[PDB]
Amino acid sequence: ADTIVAVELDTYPNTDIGDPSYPHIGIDIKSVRSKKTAKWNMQNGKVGTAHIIYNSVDKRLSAVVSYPNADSATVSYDVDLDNVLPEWVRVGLSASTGLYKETNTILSWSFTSKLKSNSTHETNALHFMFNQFSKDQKDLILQGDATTGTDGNLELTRVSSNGSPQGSSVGRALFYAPVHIWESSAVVASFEATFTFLIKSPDSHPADGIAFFISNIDSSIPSGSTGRLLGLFPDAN
Amino acid sequence: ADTIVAVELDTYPNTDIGDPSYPHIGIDIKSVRSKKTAKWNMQNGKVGTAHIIYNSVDKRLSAVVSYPNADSATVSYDVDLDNVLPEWVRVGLSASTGLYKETNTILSWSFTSKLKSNSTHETNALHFMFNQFSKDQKDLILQGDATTGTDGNLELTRVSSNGSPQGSSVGRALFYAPVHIWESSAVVASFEATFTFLIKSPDSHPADGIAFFISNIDSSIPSGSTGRLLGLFPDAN
Amino acid sequence: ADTIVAVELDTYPNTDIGDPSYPHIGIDIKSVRSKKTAKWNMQNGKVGTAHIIYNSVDKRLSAVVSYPNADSATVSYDVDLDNVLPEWVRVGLSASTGLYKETNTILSWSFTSKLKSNSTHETNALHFMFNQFSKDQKDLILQGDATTGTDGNLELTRVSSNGSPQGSSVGRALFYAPVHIWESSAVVASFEATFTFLIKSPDSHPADGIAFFISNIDSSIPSGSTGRLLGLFPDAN
Amino acid sequence: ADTIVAVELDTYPNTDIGDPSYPHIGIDIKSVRSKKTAKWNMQNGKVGTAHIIYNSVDKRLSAVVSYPNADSATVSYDVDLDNVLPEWVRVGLSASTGLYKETNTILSWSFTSKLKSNSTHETNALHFMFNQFSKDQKDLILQGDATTGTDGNLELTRVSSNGSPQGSSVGRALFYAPVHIWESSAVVASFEATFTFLIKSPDSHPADGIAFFISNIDSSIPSGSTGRLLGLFPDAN
Ligand SMILES: [Ca+2]
Ligand SMILES: [Ca+2]
Ligand SMILES: [Ca+2]
Ligand SMILES: [Ca+2]
Ligand SMILES: [Mn+2]
Ligand SMILES: [Mn+2]
Ligand SMILES: [Mn+2]
Ligand SMILES: [Mn+2]
């Protein structure tokens, strides 16, 4: 039902469904089986940063993930989003845990989209930036186990009182306002997203990951999408 | 019921309710009877621009209106918005006509709000800019007679096929996402709004005006607020 | 001597040096003989807009040129600017006329460059926007025949009192501050430039064109670069 | 000679020249004897943040300084900068030490100035943001003992190898490009500056302070302005 385009930070290798045998970043177009992936040297307990960029002229979705003092990981995929997504969409973050677990903490999130028309100086834009989340964040649609306010952070999946991450959890956060990514008179459409995250697990095998995604405006968590499905897909096809 | 703070571009002098005897700009705090006004040399048929600014440190709401090749008009009022408005609000534009009429056309509208916390680099922001409006503008809540899409503009009040403005009309447009204007750990909160408009009337006496406003998130057009009430207030108290 | 990367809006076809037989937009890497070009339906006397974009992840320089009510023209070229340009550069606009002529008027110009480091939230940026130019624009380095202030515009090449464009003219405008386009710890570097222009000629054959360019910081107009050389190259190799 | 407007973070009370008897923030208009001050609970060794704002409509220069987990300090002063400063100016940071000392480390610095003209959509802007400084920062004019690059920070005054601050030191950093703060057709001019700093001293009595300042473009450090004069004034009048 839902149309999903996402950049996944996959912490657990499910080789039975196409994941490489190591943590990786990937670009998912309507399927959890990434169209392209790159090895990611994930660091348990460290704050990392992900940057996602795209523009309608080049038609290439690219993402870069890094941690301080370390080399980055990058992945790119040629795709025309006009042919995949509706004209109006919502953007958000999703995460899940299953048998294995980890905290999926978001410390900041910014997004900027621009539509440049052929009229002189005619440019439409939307920009939001969160460097702190409140208990009652009215401009976010929280789904599943996601909550905001703990230490000013956004916890996508369940975490107990003692800070311990729970398994079989799924949660998403979408920006309240729909986003216009295509318009008939637009000559250039582009967006850039950045978010900082903290994945921590008491185990040697963290799971399952975090994903930045773009979807139809009325998207909701598919049934049974905990674990390897990242709260984004109904199955592994 | 609704809590309204607005900057009015009042084209018709209703001296019976406190308006000066000439077109004017004014700052309205919960009442159509402006707390402060300034003479405005309105130009029928010309595109004008309004700028509104405010910050929590100075606690002064100021507005400047101008037309190309002409001197500007300015008005300021000392007011602490924390004591007037809720923590979360919606921002929008409103306009009305009555016995007398005019077109209340909006050609562009931008808004920027920032909340700077005491945490290092911790800053929250929201920014939107419309330089063109679509027939189906999903990020705007249109109320009353307001419509978008005609020539890429936002028509706040009714206009016939031949471009002729109708009387007894009222319409408003609010940005879809709620806006956070106060937070317990914020050291500075501020906003700036800019919109360009085209007020045109076939008559020597245009009415009633356009207003930029901030209100509780669930605000709706009060009954009988056409004409002198600008689609904002239930009465003239 | 100078290292030049430029996007040319070439109005005169010099087929003897590789130009296609029609006005065109092209990407020039250290040579006036464009690495790639696209047909451009230039409109004499109309205000057009050019958008240039690039990022270090995709390594693709793309440009889009358009006029109101018309289809756009686009050109892209895969090039790693790190391998062509110095770490610090200046950005500017250049134009020329020769035997044939045209006005090379710039009405607005904006530029944004960003360097995102691997440190958390660590981002460096520079942004400038001119929608009007003054007689004494201290933040611009004017070279050759370029002047600012006439009607608030930037005239890159000589125009007489009666508004008539002169031949054999060359002029450039560079932003005063050097721009940092590469840094050892940067994970993503990108820039976007936009400018609106008005090319008008009394003749059926306008020449020679306008170019947005990036160069070493101490770049100056090469001798004899009027005409087909666009004020950028010392010869046609 | 120089014309200086500055916001001082004064760490040492020189009661003989008008300082209150405690660390304080103040607004200086052409004199080290602040026109207005506010008590500042300075924290040795902690990273603080200063925000400075001003606009031509309200004509009020305000500043807010804070540290994480602490209440802020604010100071405001009504002043028309058009009557004090030239049309073109440079903005920068200055610091000094004398008999007493401290490190005057700047970790980030951002600035935004805007000039809104009465022409439709006509807006000029300049924005820069440094979250990291390089050894060779070509867009900064360093004066005196100021250096960049150590740990990616800007050290305004001398610090030895072991990280120990030196006395009798003075240094300033100015952004390379001049800034336009007034224009004949501007209806609103405004600026906002933010910088984060780390003042650390091995002594119970740190000195002398850091100041954000605006000056004539060719400003240089006055002779003998170490110590209480903050590298800004030639004497204490
Ligand atoms: Ca997986
Ligand atoms: Ca009235
Ligand atoms: Ca040519
Ligand atoms: Ca002192
Ligand atoms: Mn995967
Ligand atoms: Mn009124
Ligand atoms: Mn060519
Ligand atoms: Mn003092």
Check if the beta carbon of residue D211 is closer than 8 Å to that of residue D26. Answer: no
- Residues D227, D228, D230, D235: is their CA dihedral positive or negative? negative
* Subunits close to C (at least 3 CB pairs below 8 A): A, D
For chain A, which residues lie within 8 Å of any Cβ of chain B, measuring from their own Cβ? 88, 117, 119, 121-132, 134, 136, 138-139, 152, 175-180, 183, 185, 217
- Between β-strands D179-180 and D147-150, what pairing exists: parallel, antiparallel or unpaired? unpaired
Residues 6+ apart with CB under 8 A from C14: C228
Q: Is the dihedral of CA D227, D170, D42, D30 positive or negative?
A: positive
Alpha-carbon distances of B32 from A199, B63, B207, C137, rounded to whole Å: 53, 17, 15, 45
A116: amino acid identity, one letter? K
Kindly provide the residue ranges of all beta strands, DSSP E only, lying in D97-169, ordered along the sequence: 103-117, 123-130, 140-144, 147-150, 153-155
Distance separating alpha carbons of residues B139 and B144, to the nearest angstrom: 16
CB atoms within 10 A of CB D143: 18
User: What's phi and psi for C15, nearest 5 deg?
Assistant: -60, -20
DSSP tag of A159? B
Could you tell me the maximum CA-CA distance found in chain B, to the nearest angstrom?
Answer: 56
What is the rounded CA–CA span in Å between residue A94 and residue A104?
9
Would you state the structure tokens that stand for residue D69, as one six-digit string? 């987990």
Q: Give chains near B: 3+ CB pairs under 8 A.
A: A, D
Quote the DSSP letter at residue B105.
Answer: E
Beta bridge partners of C214: C5, C91
* CA dist., res. B68 & res. C25, Å (int): 34
- D68 contact partners, CB below 8 Å, separation of at least 6: B118, B119, B120, D46, D47
Strand stretches in chain C, DSSP E: 4-10, 24-29, 36-39, 47-55, 60-66, 73-78, 88-96, 105-117, 123-130, 140-144, 147-150, 153-155, 170-175, 179-180, 186-198, 209-215
Task: Classify residue B66 by burial, with Cβ atoms within 10 Å: 0-12, 13-18, 19+.
Answer: buried
In eight-state DSSP terms, residue B152 is T
Beta bridge partners of D5: D29, D214
CB atoms within 10 A of CB B10: 26
Tokens in use for B31? 């009442």
d(CA C16, CA B186): 65
What phi and psi, each to the nearest 5 degrees, are found at residue B228?
-60, -15
Tokens of D31: 């004199």
In SS3 terms, D45-70 reads as CCEEEEEEEEECCCCEEEEEEECCCC
Q: Are strands B186-200 and B73-78 parallel, antiparallel or unpaired?
A: unpaired
Cβ atoms of A199 and A210 within 8 Å: the answer is: yes
Dihedral class, residue D45 (left if φ above 0, else alpha if ψ from -120 to 50, else beta) = left
Residue of B nearest to D73 (CA): B187
Cβ A49 vs Cβ A196: under 8 Å? yes
The CB-side HSE value for D208 (13 A sphere, CA atoms) comes to 26
Rounded distance between C-alpha atoms, residue A109 and residue A130, angstroms: 5
Q: For residues B84 and C81, give the distance between their C-alpha atoms in angstroms, rounded to a whole number.
A: 53
C15 three-class SS: helix
Q: Which residues contact A189 (CB under 8 A, 6 or more apart)?
A: A55, A56, A113, A114, A115, A116, A181, A182, A183
Distance CA C93, CA C113 (A): 16
Q: Is the dihedral of CA A114, A133, A142, A51 positive or negative?
A: positive
How far apart (Å, rounded) are the C-alpha atoms in residues B92 and B137? 14
A46 touches A94 (CB < 8 A): no
Give Cβ neighbours of residue D151 (< 8 Å, ≥ 6 apart). Answer: none
Residues sharing a CB contact under 8 Å with residue B217, sequence separation 6 or more, in sequence order: A138, B86, B88, B89, B90, B178
The SS3 call for residue D211 is strand
Q: Of C147, C175, C172, give the one whose Cα is nearest residue C232.
A: C172
Ramachandran category for residue B59: left, alpha or beta (phi over 0 → left; psi -120 to 50 → alpha): left
* CA dist list (Å): D162 to B55, D46, D102, D135: 43, 19, 14, 19
Contacts A195 to C, Cβ<8 Å: none
A131–B122 C-beta distance less than 8 A: yes
**Displacement of CA D131 from its chain's centroid (Å):** 17
Contact (Cβ atoms closer than 8 angstroms) between residue D197 and residue D104: yes
> Residue by residue, what is the 3-state secondary structure of C149-205?
EECCEEECCCECCCCCECCCCEEEEEECCCEECCCCCEEEEEEEEEEEEECCCCCCC
Look-up of token digits 């956070």:
B180
Integer-rounded Cα Rg, in Å, for chain C is: 17
- Ligand at minimal distance from the CA of C36 is 7
CA atoms of C235 and C228, how far apart (whole Å) = 9
Q: Taking the CB of residue C18, how many other CB atoms lie within 10 A of it?
A: 14
Residue ranges of alpha helices (H) inside C53-183 are none
Cβ contacts of residue D206 below 8 Å, gap of 6+?
D11, D12, D42, D44, D100, D101, D102, D199, D200
Task: Check CB contact under 8 Å for B76 and D55.
Answer: no
- Longest CA pairwise span in chain A (Å): 56
Of B183, B181, B174, B125, nearest in space to B154 by CA = B174
- C-beta of residue B230 within 8 angstroms of C-beta of residue B73: no
Closest CA to B230 of B208, B213, B206: B208
CA dist D8 to B199, D23, D233, Å?
A: 47, 10, 12
Distance between CA C141 and CA B29 in Å, rounded?
A: 48
> D115: distance to nearest CA of chain B, Å?
12
Q: Report which of D228, D225, D234, D232 is spatially closest to residue D10, judged by C-alpha positions.
A: D228
**Cis peptide leading into residue B2 (ω within 30°):** no
CATH of the domain at C66: 2.60.120.200
Ramachandran angles phi, psi of D119, nearest 5°: -80, 150
Q: What number of C-beta contacts closer than 8 Å exist between A and B?
A: 75
| B182 Cα–ligand 6 center, Å | 28
Experimental approach was: neutron
| φ and ψ of D82, to 5 deg | -65, -30
Residue with tokens 């120089």, as numbered in its chain: D2
Among the partner residues A127, A138, A178, nearest to B138 by beta-carbon distance: A178
Q: Which residues of A touch C (CB under 8 A)?
A: 47, 49, 51, 53, 55, 57-58, 60, 62, 64, 66-70, 72, 74, 76, 108, 116, 118-121, 131, 187-188, 190, 194, 196
- Are C101 and C93 in contact by the 8 Å Cβ rule? The answer is no
Q: Which residues of A touch B121 (CB under 8 A)?
A: 131
Q: Would the CA dihedral through C172, C173, C175, C177 be positive or negative?
A: positive
Specify whether the CB–CB gap between B185 and A145 falls below 8 A.
no
Name the residue in chain C with its Cα closest to that of D182.
Answer: C134
Residue C58 with chain A: CB contacts under 8 Å: 58, 60, 62, 76
What's the gap in Å between the CA of A127 and the closest CA on chain B?
A: 5
Which of D82, D101, D73, D56 is closest to D8 using CA atoms?
Answer: D73
For B57, the closest of D49, D62, D69 (CB atoms) is D62
Which residue in the block uniquely carries the two structure tokens 């040297």? A41
Residue D92 CA: distances (Å) to CA of C233, D36, D113, D170, D193? 37, 21, 14, 14, 10
Q: Which residue, B87, B94, B89, is CA-closest to B32? A: B94
C49 - beta bridge partners? C66, C196
Dihedral, CA of residue C222, residue C228, residue C232 and residue C237, to nearest 10:
-80
The rounded distance, in Å, linking the Cα atoms of C152 and C164 is: 17
Q: Cα dist. B41→A6, B67, C110 in Å?
A: 53, 9, 33
Q: Position D103: which residue type?
A: T
Strand B103-117 to strand C147-150: parallel, antiparallel, or no bridges (unpaired)?
unpaired
**What range defines the domain where residue D39 resides?**
1-237
Classify the phi-psi angles of A43: left when phi > 0, otherwise alpha if psi is within -120 to 50, otherwise beta: beta
User: Which one-letter DSSP state was computed for residue B28?
Assistant: E
Strand partners, A89: A179
Among chain C residues, the shortest Cα distance to D137 is held by: C180
Measured at the alpha carbon of residue A92, what is the angle toward residues A90 and A93, in degrees to the nearest 5? 165
Other CB atoms within 10 Å distance of the CB of residue D48: 24
Kindly state the tokens that stand for A176: 């309240």
The tokens describing B234, both together, are 């239930």
Neighbours of D54 (CB within 10 A): 25
CA distances from D142 to A64, B59, D150 (A): 34, 37, 14
Residue C85 tokens, joined = 């340009």
Of D215, D186, D210, D190, nearest in space to D200 by CA: D210
Tell me the one-letter amino acid at D139: D
CA proximity to B81, closest of B150, B4, B157: B4
Q: How far apart are CA B107 and CA B152, in angstroms?
A: 8
SS3 C95: strand
Distance of CA D94 to the CA centre of its chain: 6
> d(Cα D42, Cα D8) in Å, to the nearest integer?
13
Number of domains in chain B: 1
Three-class secondary structure of residue D219 per DSSP: coil
Strand-pair partners of B29: B5
Looking at chain B, the number of H-run helices and the number of E-run strands are 0, 16
